[PDB]
From a paper:
[name] is a cytosolic DNA nuclease essential for regulation of cGAS-STING immune signaling.
We identified conditions for the growth of hTREX1 Chi 2, Chi 3.1, Chi 4.1, and Chi 5.1 crystals and determined three crystal structures (hTREX1 Chi 3.1, Chi 4.1, and Chi 5.1).
Author numbering:
A (entry chain A), B (entry chain A): 6 to 46, 54 to 166, 174 to 236
Write the structure that this text describes.
Amino acid sequence: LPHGHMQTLIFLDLEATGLPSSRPEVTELCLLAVHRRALENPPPVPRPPRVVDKLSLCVAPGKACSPAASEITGLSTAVLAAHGRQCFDDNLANLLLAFLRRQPQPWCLVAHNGDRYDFPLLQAELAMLGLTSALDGAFCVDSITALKALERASRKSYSLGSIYTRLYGQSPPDSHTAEGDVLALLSICQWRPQALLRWVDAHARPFGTIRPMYGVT
Amino acid sequence: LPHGHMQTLIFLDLEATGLPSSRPEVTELCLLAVHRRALENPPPVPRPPRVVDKLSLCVAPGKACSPAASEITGLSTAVLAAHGRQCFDDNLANLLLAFLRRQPQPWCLVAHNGDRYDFPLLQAELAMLGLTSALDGAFCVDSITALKALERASRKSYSLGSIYTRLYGQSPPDSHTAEGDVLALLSICQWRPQALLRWVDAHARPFGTIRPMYGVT
């Protein structure tokens, strides 16, 4: 194991104003911290663990949401401003780090398509604030890569809804809201928990090696 | 209005090791921040607003949970320790304040039986850390007093489950978990949202006037 056994899996999802090439900005985020103990034990959807830490926040972006983004997430810059949401700032970064500091280390962020979207976007927002190494103590894995390895070890789509529906026979409840996507990802990761933990431990990647989607590197 | 219109209602619930006379310690907490805009519009349960901030955390108490507490909340000091939960510390207090700083002011904490339990207990945990004025910028109301005034304005129990069942014809889903109790309280406060906001604005009480359940005053 490159960095030992991960103690806490922090399932993560970011919603934003658009796609990577549009220089997107976070509109919503959810972090759900689950200790390794909770993952050490047609079918029914597994129940979430009793002991979990959860953080869900809406963020006012510095730009307009694309029509597709508002259609998908139900959020817009006007709606976020009507609720007095604040931009991505130092206080938000301090909040995220304080949330992670509640969790036993090593931390491992888990996000669906995180290597291409969630992780670079989070690094980009931190880079704009000059907090380039704020979350360097954490590790991260992409659950798309994880679930591909698990299912193939025993063509399919490996989107969040495709895997969820393929395993449990129904679509996840609250699709394309940060918390709903995190809870659906947790349910899928509870399918084969021990096999997931083995894969996460072997593929845990330092968050500092994640290049930001934009901004200084 | 004593302190103007409240901008953000932060629904709050604390779970602990026991009753006030036992010097209880927090085992779980949930904060759900809802801007006033979201409350400005047999019956079905109202849907929660799209734009909400949520924080749910489990806390390792410095003592054992009473059998009744573990029976009710599903938590115990051993279970919390098995998941590596940390005690109520400076980092947790910084986290709570950073969460509130995401919300437009004035802040108004809302808790069922908060005047007798949730508010004094939170003040007690902060007082043990010497952070006696950490949340002094916030206001607070007890939703038991609020819902009594609303229903009487048009003998009943005014417990969370009694009001919820009386209004919506069923019991709340996740009873006696911090997040479940907060979501049930939100649904009840959405019954007559405009009347609730009028009552909250007139009865908003500075959190600094809340005496701690124990510790230095």
